[PDB]
Write a protein that binds this DNA or RNA. Structure first.
Lengths: 224, 72, 129, 149, 62, 195, 48
RNA sequence: AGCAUUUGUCUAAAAUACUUCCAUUAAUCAAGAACGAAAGUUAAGGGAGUGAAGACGAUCAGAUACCGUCGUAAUCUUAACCAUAAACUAUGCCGACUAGGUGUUGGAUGAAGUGCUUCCUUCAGUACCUUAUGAGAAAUCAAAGUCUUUGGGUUCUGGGG
RNA sequence: AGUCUGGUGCCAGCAGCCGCGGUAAUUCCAGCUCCAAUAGCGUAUAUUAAAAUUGUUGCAGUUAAAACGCUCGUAGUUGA
């Protein structure tokens, strides 16, 4: 709506000098502005609008001279259901505040997962194109693709996370302590992140580069 | 769908959300040593920069491109 | 004591790729190592390699394309039959889409798919992707 | 390294070419004769090779003659029944046992004496397998003086 | 492709699924066999058909 | 060419010293037996021109920031910045300044030019989180980590810093539309430096 | 291997080490030792 | 395990050097064997000092303890034995590959300070400091790295209290 | 799937497990409502998955359990 970005990259997005989040991922630019994501996934106009879910509220306590203080850490999962997941974490003294801060974090956190085929090009992209394994704390979680009709093989937490990411046919497995949920979520998120990190034959081809938004819109960027 | 890109120096793929890797824009000269219109751009991964081999790799790449003559 | 050269050599190549070397010096040299490099060139992983002659043992200097995610050796060199291959690749490879599992079979050293198409089992040497 | 804790690599470098030097164009017979004289004088094959390099100035026999010195001695039928290497090892072990007989409190001498004899057994077993020591042969410390006599 | 068990079993399964009425007109390939869903199997039931034809006014009535 | 090279040669720029970094030895010419390192300087000149080539190719020079912690280098960076239209940053780098979006010094720069990356280390670290290539005037004891462009020089004297920035400024002004390359730039030689 | 032999002829070692080391588990000890049928009064019945 | 006076003797040892010899002799090893601190046992010396036991004076609520003074066994050597210790780099051994700098001990290579001294290059030892887009539960670790992207070889070991 | 109603008051008792009960009980004893599966559903013992907690695939051994005090060595496994 009428919201004000104070970053120049934000202001480019606000005007519409940048078409997609994909370009910002291309030039690997830091995102400290939620409005970019809100503009691109435009709730009533979007093809695949971002869907939220508070996965875990946890008590944590400092302990002090005059007694205990309960703070609340909050983990939230957000996803388009098609290709972009986000995992957001905030600790605050008040639960609803924690949840809102986490949702803002989740939008900033927003990452593209690579979706392809298990094998043959006989339908649409539907799962990770290869193994990814992600570690956080004790827990190392491995996603490995399954053939079609083999949707969401894994634990409930994994099912939800893969659904937000838009992954269908895959096996999940795990090593270490699953029970620690924040690490478990993060380990999944780490694996999803690795998907555009692994090299594939299609990426043997030479790469040549579009120029920076900071050079493409330099005059408008000075002006506004 | 997202298209990732690779480091010029190492061939290595650069992740989407990494936030440290860079694109180095090098201006071509005009005959009297003024800025020409054209610019050659090269992609440097964060790992090489953290190592501090970026200057050496860049020098090797510039020599291959004929943008430096002294090689090393 | 040194035992099989090939595994340490492939780990060295993996380390070299992780480091980002572009070229690397293998101090071991053998017929099987040469065949493996020729095979890696066949599958577009390795470029050119130069074998340097010393009577005691040559050396090999390999130009790397940086495309490797990992190259490794399976020891012991297990026997594997044609229908067993599917289990082995499912275990080893990052995907069924790409990556290459290498055998030695009575039609020569070759990857699993080629061997499978041919039709003979054999011993497993290694893999790369 | 077999028993030591080192791994020192000081050794013979060896040139790339197996061809004769420019300096010496000597006939095979001259090279055999020179070795034969050293052998006859009672020098042992390592000593002969060392002497051939230093005293006679010649690059080593396998390069200038195309055949190993031990093999040349064997071909003329004059090669020693006990190995040079085995002879020195047994001699060192005998020396240690003589010393140990005098001194019973030298633990390191005892430790080395079992170690060296174990090395002799391994070397002996290899020589038996290559058929250079008899099938019935065995090392004994009693007969060791007779062995190197 | 081109395996005797595979082409025999696949042709037989597809024929049978067509006869049961699970598969559509051009649904004759293995990704449609994977494509099947629980409502479609339920739809083959006689009570569902009796409701559908309008013989009864509800599935439970059917 | 050679007159500029000679001015660098008479200047103190090429005097390397003991404790010299591994990476930098391809720019060192020889170890002196007196415990000092001679720097080739010829590669430095061509490399400085490469740095000028990257700087010129930037659409807005006023988004290109110069930095020096050093008291004596502070005037030299400010004068260098004044001519080329850059912002100079002197003394403390407030640690969140590029990264943080509500801080007073909130800045989205295109390129960063560093006086000694040993001294100016916080800016160098921040620059890597902000995806900036980084030019750095590097010395014997200086890191080469993070930075893409390394310029060899002794950076512990005011005249050296000033001469290299002054020469860089002439080269950039020549690459720019400001003045023809045919005639020497006569402005403020021996005069960027501290009082 | 590491802490295990790879060896082609080492199936012998793998069997023997597995056979010896299996006994350390409590459930296994209870299941395969005779004490079960002895000290327990019910001895393979739910009910008595 | 352990090893510090002088000189000699009997012995072993590693690295360096080698256009010297052998020609696969190897690696790790159930069984079995060797060496194995301290204390203890048994026999001779010796019994200085220290000193389990023990004795007194205190101390103290009590003190059979700390503290003070005395003091047998023991400490030491020779001759047997004994066979364990936080017998700890708390990290099995062999083997490759990996990262900088500051050092340091034993050799070899070059040069300049005044043959020698220093420094440079290199080997085999050996620590520290920083760095690990390496690792790990973190402490930390250049090995505890090259390990769900899991297989260099091997012995031994553990399976909740 | 209930901050539902009375009675009991570390008692009676329940509850694989964590726990509830010592006076304004959401865990007991009833009652009410709700929920799950259903002509079947509890309970126990046996056994598999779970368990990459016996580990070929596929464990762990600096500090959590675990490198034989140390070395040689036959069987053994491995051997450019």
């Amino acid at each position: 709506k009428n919201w004000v970005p104070v970053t120049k990259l934000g202001r480019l997005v606000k005007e519409g000098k940048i078409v997609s989040i994909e370009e910002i991922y291309l030039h690997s630019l830091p995102i400290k502005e939620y409005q970019i994501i809100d503009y691109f996934f435009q709730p009533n106009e979007c093809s695949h609008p971002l869907k939220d879910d508070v996965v875990k509220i946890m008590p944590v306590q400092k302990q002090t001279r005059a007694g205990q203080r309960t703070r609340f850490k909050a983990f939230v999962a957000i996803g388009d259901g098609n290709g972009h997941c986000g995992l957001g974490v905030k600790c605050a003294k008040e639960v609803a505040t924690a949840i809102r801060g986490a949702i803002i974090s989740a939008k900033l956190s927003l990452i593209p997962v690579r979706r392809g085929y298990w094998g043959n090009k006989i339908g649409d992209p539907h799962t990770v194109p290869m193994k990814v394994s992600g570690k956080c704390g004790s827990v190392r979680i491995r996603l490995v693709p399954a053939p079609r009709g083999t949707q969401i093989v894994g634990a409930p937490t994994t099912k939800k996370m893969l659904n937000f990411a838009g992954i269908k046919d895959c096996f999940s497995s795990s090593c270490g302590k699953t029970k620690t949920k924040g690490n478990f979520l993060r380990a999944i998120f780490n694996a999803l992140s690795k998907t555009y990190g692994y090299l594939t034959p299609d990426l043997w081809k030479v790469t040549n580069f579009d120029k920076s938004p900071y050079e493409e819109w330099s005059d408008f960027l000075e002006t506004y | 769908i997202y298209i990732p890109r690779k480091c010029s120096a190492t061939s290595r793929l650069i992740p989407a959300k990494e936030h440290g890797a860079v694109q180095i824009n090098v201006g071509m000269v005009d005959a009297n040593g003024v800025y020409n219109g054209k610019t050659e751009t090269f992609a440097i991964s964060g790992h090489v920069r953290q190592n501090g081999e970026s200057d050496a790799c860049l020098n090797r790449l510039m020599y291959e491109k004929k943008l430096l003559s002294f090689q090393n | 004591v040194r035992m099989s050269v090939l595994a340490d050599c492939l780990k060295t190549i993996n380390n070299a790729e992780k480091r980002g070397r572009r070229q690397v010096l293998i101090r071991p040299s053998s017929k099987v190592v040469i065949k493996f490099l020729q095979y890696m060139q066949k599958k577009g992983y390795i470029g050119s390699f130069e074998i340097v002659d010393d009577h005691r043992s040559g050396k090999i200097v390999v130009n790397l394309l940086g495309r490797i995610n990992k190259c490794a050796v399976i020891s012991p060199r297990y026997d594997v039959k044609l229908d067993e291959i599917e289990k082995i690749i499912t275990s080893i490879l990052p995907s069924r889409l790409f990556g290459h599992l290498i055998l030695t079979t009575p039609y020569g050293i070759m990857d699993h798919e080629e061997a499978r198409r041919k039709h003979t089992g054999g011993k497993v040497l290694g893999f790369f992707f | 390294r077999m028993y030591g804790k080192g791994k020192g690599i000081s050794s013979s470098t060896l040139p790339y070419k197996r061809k004769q030097p420019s300096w010496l164009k000597q006939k095979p017979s001259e090279i055999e004769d020179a070795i034969i004289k050293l052998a006859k004088k009672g020098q042992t094959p390592s000593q002969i090779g060392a002497t051939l390099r230093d005293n006679y100035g010649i690059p080593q026999v396998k390069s200038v003659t195309g055949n190993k010195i031990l093999r040349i001695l064997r071909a003329q039928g004059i090669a020693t029944t006990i190995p040079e290497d085995l002879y020195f090892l047994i001699k060192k072990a005998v020396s240690m046992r003589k010393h140990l007989e005098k001194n019973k409190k030298d633990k390191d001498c005892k430790f080395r004496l079992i170690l060296t004899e174990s090395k002799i057994h391994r070397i002996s077993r290899y020589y038996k397998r290559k058929k250079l020591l008899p099938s019935n042969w065995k090392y004994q410390s009693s007969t060791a003086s007779a062995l190197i006599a | 492709e081109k395996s005797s068990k595979r082409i025999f079993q696949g042709e037989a399964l597809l024929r049978r699924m067509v006869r049961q009425g699970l598969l559509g007109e051009n649904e004759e390939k293995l990704d449609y066999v994977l494509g099947l869903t629980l409502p479609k199997l339920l739809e083959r039931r006689l009570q569902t058909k009796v409701f559908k034809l309008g013989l009864a006014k509800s599935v439970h009535h059917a | 060419k050679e007159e500029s090279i000679a001015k660098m040669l008479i200047c103190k720029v090429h005097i390397g010293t003991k404790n010299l970094e591994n990476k930098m030895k391809r720019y060192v010419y020889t170890r002196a037996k007196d415990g000092v390192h001679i720097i080739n300087l010829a590669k430095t000149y061509e490399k400085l021109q490469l740095a000028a080539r990257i700087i010129v190719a930037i659409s807005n020079p006023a988004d290109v920031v110069v930095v020096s912690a050093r008291p004596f280098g502070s005037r030299a960076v400010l004068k260098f910045a004044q001519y080329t239209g850059a912002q100079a940053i002197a003394g403390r780098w407030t640690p969140g300044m590029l990264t943080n979006q509500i801080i007073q010094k909130f800045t989205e720069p295109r390129l960063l030019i560093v006086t000694d990356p040993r001294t100016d280390a916080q800016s160098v670290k921040e620059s890597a989180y902000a995806n900036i290539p980084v030019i750095a005037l590097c010395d014997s004891d200086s890191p080469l980590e993070h930075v893409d462009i390394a310029i060899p020089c002794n950076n512990k004297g005011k005249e050296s810093i000033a001469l290299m920035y002054w020469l860089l400024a002439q080269e950039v002004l020549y690459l720019k539309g400001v003045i023809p390359r045919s005639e020497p730039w006569n402005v403020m030689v021996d005069m960027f430096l501290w009082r | 291997g590491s802490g295990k032999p790879s060896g082609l002829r080492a199936a012998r070692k793998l069997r023997i080490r597995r056979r010896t080391q299996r006994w350390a588990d409590k459930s296994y000890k209870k299941s395969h030792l005779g004490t079960r049928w002895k000290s327990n009064p019910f001895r393979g019945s739910s009910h008595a």
